[PDB]
Design an enzyme around this catalytic site. Structure first.
Site, mmCIF file in Angstrom:
data_model
loop_
_atom_site.group_PDB
_atom_site.id
_atom_site.type_symbol
_atom_site.label_atom_id
_atom_site.label_comp_id
_atom_site.label_asym_id
_atom_site.label_seq_id
_atom_site.Cartn_x
_atom_site.Cartn_y
_atom_site.Cartn_z
ATOM 1 N N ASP A 34 0.822 -1.228 0.000
ATOM 2 C CA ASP A 34 0.000 0.000 0.000
ATOM 3 C C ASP A 34 0.839 1.254 0.000
ATOM 4 O O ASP A 34 1.275 1.729 1.069
ATOM 5 C CB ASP A 34 -0.865 0.019 1.281
ATOM 6 C CG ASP A 34 -1.781 1.198 1.331
ATOM 7 O OD1 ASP A 34 -2.236 1.570 2.410
ATOM 8 O OD2 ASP A 34 -2.100 1.827 0.302
ATOM 9 N N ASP A 214 -2.097 5.280 -5.319
ATOM 10 C CA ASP A 214 -2.375 4.395 -4.208
ATOM 11 C C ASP A 214 -2.657 2.947 -4.640
ATOM 12 O O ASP A 214 -3.764 2.606 -5.047
ATOM 13 C CB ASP A 214 -3.559 4.953 -3.409
ATOM 14 C CG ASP A 214 -3.747 4.284 -2.110
ATOM 15 O OD1 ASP A 214 -3.052 3.301 -1.847
ATOM 16 O OD2 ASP A 214 -4.597 4.646 -1.276
HETATM 17 C C1 TIT Z 1 -8.845 8.298 7.334
HETATM 18 C C2 TIT Z 1 -7.861 9.284 7.264
HETATM 19 C C3 TIT Z 1 -8.374 10.500 7.752
HETATM 20 C C4 TIT Z 1 -6.744 8.891 8.011
HETATM 21 C C5 TIT Z 1 -5.603 8.955 7.213
HETATM 22 N N1 TIT Z 1 -5.141 7.707 6.961
HETATM 23 C C6 TIT Z 1 -4.645 7.346 5.770
HETATM 24 O O1 TIT Z 1 -4.602 8.245 4.740
HETATM 25 C C7 TIT Z 1 -4.136 6.043 5.615
HETATM 26 C C8 TIT Z 1 -2.808 6.009 6.101
HETATM 27 N N2 TIT Z 1 -4.176 5.610 4.323
HETATM 28 C C9 TIT Z 1 -5.311 5.165 3.721
HETATM 29 O O2 TIT Z 1 -6.488 5.146 4.401
HETATM 30 C C10 TIT Z 1 -5.298 4.760 2.368
HETATM 31 C C11 TIT Z 1 -4.909 3.381 2.208
HETATM 32 O O3 TIT Z 1 -4.380 3.248 0.949
HETATM 33 C C12 TIT Z 1 -6.020 2.462 2.368
HETATM 34 C C13 TIT Z 1 -5.565 1.102 2.432
HETATM 35 O O4 TIT Z 1 -6.495 0.294 3.083
HETATM 36 C C14 TIT Z 1 -7.060 -0.819 2.457
HETATM 37 C C15 TIT Z 1 -8.065 -1.448 3.234
HETATM 38 C C16 TIT Z 1 -9.002 -0.683 4.008
HETATM 39 C C17 TIT Z 1 -10.054 -1.337 4.726
HETATM 40 C C18 TIT Z 1 -10.180 -2.762 4.679
HETATM 41 BR BR1 TIT Z 1 -11.297 -3.452 5.434
HETATM 42 C C19 TIT Z 1 -9.249 -3.538 3.915
HETATM 43 C C20 TIT Z 1 -8.198 -2.876 3.201
HETATM 44 N N3 TIT Z 1 -6.934 2.590 1.365
HETATM 45 C C21 TIT Z 1 -8.251 2.759 1.599
HETATM 46 O O5 TIT Z 1 -8.719 2.813 2.874
HETATM 47 C C22 TIT Z 1 -9.159 2.872 0.516
HETATM 48 N N4 TIT Z 1 -10.100 1.905 0.702
HETATM 49 C C23 TIT Z 1 -10.275 0.838 -0.117
HETATM 50 O O6 TIT Z 1 -9.489 0.676 -1.231
HETATM 51 C C24 TIT Z 1 -10.939 -0.358 0.213
HETATM 52 C C25 TIT Z 1 -10.756 -1.558 -0.521
HETATM 53 C C26 TIT Z 1 -11.429 -2.726 -0.101
HETATM 54 C C27 TIT Z 1 -12.244 -2.701 0.986
HETATM 55 C C28 TIT Z 1 -12.414 -1.489 1.704
HETATM 56 N N5 TIT Z 1 -11.764 -0.356 1.303
HETATM 57 C C29 TIT Z 1 -9.768 4.198 0.480
HETATM 58 C C30 TIT Z 1 -8.837 5.189 0.148
HETATM 59 C C31 TIT Z 1 -10.808 4.276 -0.458
HETATM 60 C C32 TIT Z 1 -4.605 9.706 7.856
HETATM 61 N N6 TIT Z 1 -4.541 11.031 7.672
HETATM 62 O O7 TIT Z 1 -3.690 9.080 8.669
#
Ligand code: TIT
Length: 325
Positions: A34, A214
């Site tokens: 990721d 991503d």
């Molecule tokens: C929420 C924020 C405010 C917090 C933020 N955090 C982040 O930016 C983190 C570090 N990175 C991310 O969230 C982006 C990642 O690439 C993330 C990777 O996660 C994949 C994932 C998520 C949930 C489940 Br269940 C299984 C797999 N992708 C995702 O969460 C993606 N979801 C999905 O691709 C996805 C795929 C399959 C099932 C469920 N979600 C999403 C972008 C659309 C921060 N400022 O620290």
């Protein structure tokens, strides 16, 4: 080969996985690799939630190289959360290893139901330091600083369902993965692998859009107003959006730059669901709003385009992926 190559497996042209080991006894795990994240986590034998029961569970008592930490940590993603504690141990990716700080997850309730339905155990982040929780240097940056690689860069050649496997490659660029020119785009921020590009779908535009490349995301995400404008009079039905796969009104994404032009056509961003019905597609495009209007170019984009993530030159390289090796 003169680089470290780790094979990537496909899961129905939606997601892909890669394996790495943790512990000096090389306990195996399946990971989402990721670039949108900056932490490594594996589920621990100390995990108490139901999701963990079928997963490869990391056991620190089996590794002479384990090094206690214990600091509590919650890992938040856009679409879920997992929590646990820090630990340190040998992490091995392809044929390169290093002592590395990672998270032992003991609670996965915030990832369900996806977690239990999916084959991955954890996530292996590949973004930049300031994106990480616990101030942890990226794996590839450490490899460079430890003289285990000469170039702090990695590439993704994604797998395609029923056509070919993929490769995460660390340490250098292999011409066999791509065709046509390789274009470099400078990071707007050392955080995610994010670059500035002009977005155009129809008569819709967003100049200087923030674009996150991503690999850990299985859709394209766009700002919600932009999505709504795209949907106008398009013959899609708001149930997530379903369309005929051949819906002739489905537009092409254009992303332009100072010196690169990249497109994404419907065949790449449609998630075929022909088991729900014969000629039936899901729009694999989600609306999501950040403080600044952002596009996440996920797996649909990276399946078409080969990518290079270069920490030394603070940039992302983009080229057409070879349709077959
Ligand atoms: C929420 C924020 C405010 C917090 C933020 N955090 C982040 O930016 C983190 C570090 N990175 C991310 O969230 C982006 C990642 O690439 C993330 C990777 O996660 C994949 C994932 C998520 C949930 C489940 Br269940 C299984 C797999 N992708 C995702 O969460 C993606 N979801 C999905 O691709 C996805 C795929 C399959 C099932 C469920 N979600 C999403 C972008 C659309 C921060 N400022 O620290």
């Amino acid at each position: 080969s003169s680089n470290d190559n780790i094979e990537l497996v496909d899961f129905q042209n939606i997601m892909f996985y890669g394996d790495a080991e943790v512990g000096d006894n090389q306990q195996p795990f399946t990971f989402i690799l990721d670039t949108g994240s900056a932490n490594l986590w594996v589920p621990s034998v100390k995990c108490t939630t139901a999701g963990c029961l079928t997963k490869h569970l990391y056991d620190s008592s089996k590794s002479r190289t384990y090094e206690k930490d214990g600091t509590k940590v919650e890992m938040n993603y856009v679409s879920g959360t997992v929590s646990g504690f820090f630990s340190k141990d040998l992490v091995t990716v392809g044929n390169l290893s290093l002592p590395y700080k990672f998270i032992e997850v003991i609670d996965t309730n915030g990832f369900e139901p996806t977690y239990t339905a999916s084959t991955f155990d954890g996530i292996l982040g590949l973004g930049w330091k300031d994106l990480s929780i616990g101030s942890v240097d990226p794996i590839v940056v450490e490899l460079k600083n430890q003289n285990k690689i000469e170039n702090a860069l990695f590439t993704f050649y994604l797998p395609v369902h029923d056509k070919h496997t993929g490769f995460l490659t660390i340490g250098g660029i292999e011409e066999r993965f791509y065709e046509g020119p390789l274009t470099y785009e400078k990071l707007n921020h050392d955080l995610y692998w994010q670059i500035t590009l002009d977005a155009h779908v129809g008569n819709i535009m967003l100049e200087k859009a923030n674009c996150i490349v991503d690999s850990g995301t299985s859709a394209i995400t766009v700002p919600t107003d932009f999505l709504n404008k795209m949907l106008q009079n398009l013959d899609v039905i708001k149930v997530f959006y379903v369309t005929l796969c051949n819906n002739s009104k489905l537009p092409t994404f254009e992303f332009t730059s100072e010196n690169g032009k990249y497109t994404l056509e419907p065949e790449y961003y449609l998630q075929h669901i022909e088991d729900v019905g014969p000629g039936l597609c899901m729009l694999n495009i989600i609306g999501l709003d950040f403080p600044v209007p952002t596009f996440i170019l996920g797996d649909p984009f990276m399946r078409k385009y080969f990518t290079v993530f270069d920490y030394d030159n603070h940039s992302v390289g983009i080229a057409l992926a070879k349709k077959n090796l």
